[PDB]
Design a protein around this ligand. Structure first.
Ligand SMILES: *C/C=C(C)/C=C/C=C(C)/C=C/C1=C(C)CCCC1(C)C
Ligand SMILES: CCCCCCCCCCCCCCCCCCCC
Ligand SMILES: CCCCCCCCCCCCCCCCCCCC
Ligand SMILES: CCCCCCCCCCCCCCCCCCCC
Ligand SMILES: CCCCCCCCCCCCCCCCCCCC
Ligand SMILES: CCCCCCCCCCCCCCCCCCCC
Ligand SMILES: CCCCCCCCCCCCCCCCCCCC
Ligand SMILES: CCCCCCCCCCCCCCCCCCCC
Ligand SMILES: CCCCCCCCCCCCCCCCCCCC
Ligand SMILES: CCCCCCCCCCCCCCCCCCCC
Ligand SMILES: CCCCCCCCCCCCCCCCCCCC
Ligand SMILES: CCCCCCCCCCCCCCCCCCCC
Ligand SMILES: CCCCCCCCCCCCCCCCCCCC
Ligand SMILES: CCCCCCCCCCCCCCCCCCCC
Ligand SMILES: CCCCCCCCCCCCCCCCCCCC
Ligand code: NA
Length: 268
């Protein structure tokens, strides 16, 4: 039994350990992550004056998302460096028994908080036509919670039981597909009877949303995407996972918020 090594990161850390490059790169990409959220926090606060009152709830939710993301990605970053330690003999970083070990809790909590806010906020910028506010809202929130919960359950079994990891990921994916389906409704209805410039921004938002959100399951799967003898079943998978999460974080939270801000202004 390899009892020290909960998740793939710990598993690698406890067995092969991480090269200087993988340790440092992961550390640095996670740092950039939280750095960008803090910048984004200040951006959304400073620019709130640039949109009409009726749209400002969106700016508000952008800012609160930035707070949660800053704190929890900061905590995650520290947890990474705290968890692995240099062995001079071998010249690699190994799971440190006198630490807390790498923990996915920070990110999944961040998701639990941010997903419902990101989905909600667009409903304060665009108008529906034939759909009802309260139904779209409840649909986003329900499927959003279920997506994360099932995903979290899946994550538990990542090393102990890969079959379970993937099955729960598939269940999660179903809730994902529902959310995509509703969002696409929202965007189409939101286009009707706004200026073409605004329609164009909404088109960009749709593609951003679709791509950035799909990165998350990408990064979930990343280490397994070349089989269990594979290039990615390795510290390179860890590096790729964390890189892709961070790109997704910046895209889904910051860029998304900026575009919604921009839409609100064309509607102002
Ligand atoms: C700001 C953070 C966001 C927008 C996080 C979004 C997370 C997801 C869309 C996660 C999706 C997942 C699946 C659909 C399958 C694998 C498990 C998850 C939870 C990673
Ligand atoms: C309005 C244009 C504002 C430009 C924002 C530039 C971001 C600066 C972040 C530096 C850290
Ligand atoms: C060390 C990392 C550097 C931090 C800077 C990160 C920059 C993101 C902060 C939010 C800035 C968004 C500004 C976008 C301006 C778009 C204006 C569009 C009008 C056409
Ligand atoms: C209204 C113009 C304000 C834009 C300031 C940009 C701040 C970037 C945050 C770092
Ligand atoms: C723009 C008017 C503000 C509406 C707030 C409703 C959000 C409640 C969140 C719980
Ligand atoms: C509504 C957003 C408030 C932020 C909640 C995140 C809790 C911070 C925890 C820090 C690390 C534990
Ligand atoms: C479904 C989302 C569950 C997230 C809860 C996990 C939060 C853990 C916070 C950090 C753990 C420190 C020990
Ligand atoms: C108004 C948006 C509600 C999101 C708050 C976070 C959900 C509770 C997590 C505990
Ligand atoms: C829906 C996923 C079904 C299980 C995938 C089969 C591979 C399991 C690896 C052991
Ligand atoms: C496609 C719908 C899948 C139904 C399975 C739902 C399983 C419930 C999760 C239990 C959470 C505690
Ligand atoms: C037609 C131009 C579409 C631009 C929308 C956003 C671009 C996708 C970025 C995905 C995140 C990586
Ligand atoms: C044409 C306007 C492009 C908006 C999407 C910009 C996203 C940057 C890609 C990362
Ligand atoms: C149709 C959605 C396009 C998104 C593709 C990006 C997913 C790649 C996952 C990382 C490798
Ligand atoms: C919903 C499943 C998302 C997985 C996208 C990543 C596929 C990469 C193919 C290699
Ligand atoms: C005319 C189109 C204006 C939309 C521009 C949106 C770009 C958002 C910029 C945020 C990207 C931060 C990434 C910095 C990483 C270092
Ligand atoms: Na260390």
């Amino acid at each position: 039994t390899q009892e020290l090594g909960a998740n793939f990161e710990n598993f690698i850390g406890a067995t092969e350990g991480f090269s200087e490059i993988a340790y440092q790169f992961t550390s640095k990409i996670l740092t950039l992550g939280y750095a960008v959220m803090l910048a984004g926090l200040l951006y959304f606060i400073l620019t709130i004056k640039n949109v009409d009152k009726k749209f400002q709830m969106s700016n508000i939710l952008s800012a609160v998302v930035m707070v949660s993301a800053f704190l929890l990605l900061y905590a995650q970053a520290q947890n990474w460096t705290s968890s692995f330690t240099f062995n001079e003999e071998v010249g690699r970083y190994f799971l440190d028994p006198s630490g807390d070990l790498f923990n996915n809790g920070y990110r999944y909590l961040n998701w639990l908080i941010d997903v419902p806010m990101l989905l909600f906020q667009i409903l304060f910028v665009v108008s529906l036509t034939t759909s009802k506010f309260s139904s779209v809202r409840n649909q986003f929130w329900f499927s959003g919670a279920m997506m994360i919960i099932t995903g979290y359950i899946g994550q538990f079994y990542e090393v102990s039981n890969l079959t379970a990891f993937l099955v729960w990921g598939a269940i999660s994916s179903a809730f994902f597909f529902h959310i995509l389906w509703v969002m696409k409704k929202v965007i189409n209805e939101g286009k009707e009877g706004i200026s073409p410039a605004g329609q164009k921004i909404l088109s960009n938002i749709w593609i951003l949303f679709l791509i950035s959100w799909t990165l998350y399951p990408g990064a979930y799967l990343m280490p397994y995407l070349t089989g269990v003898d594979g290039f990615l079943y390795s510290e390179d998978g860890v590096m790729a996972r964390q890189l892709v999460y961070t790109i997704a974080d910046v895209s889904s939270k910051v860029i998304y918020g900026v575009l919604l801000g921009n839409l609100a202004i064309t509607l102002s």
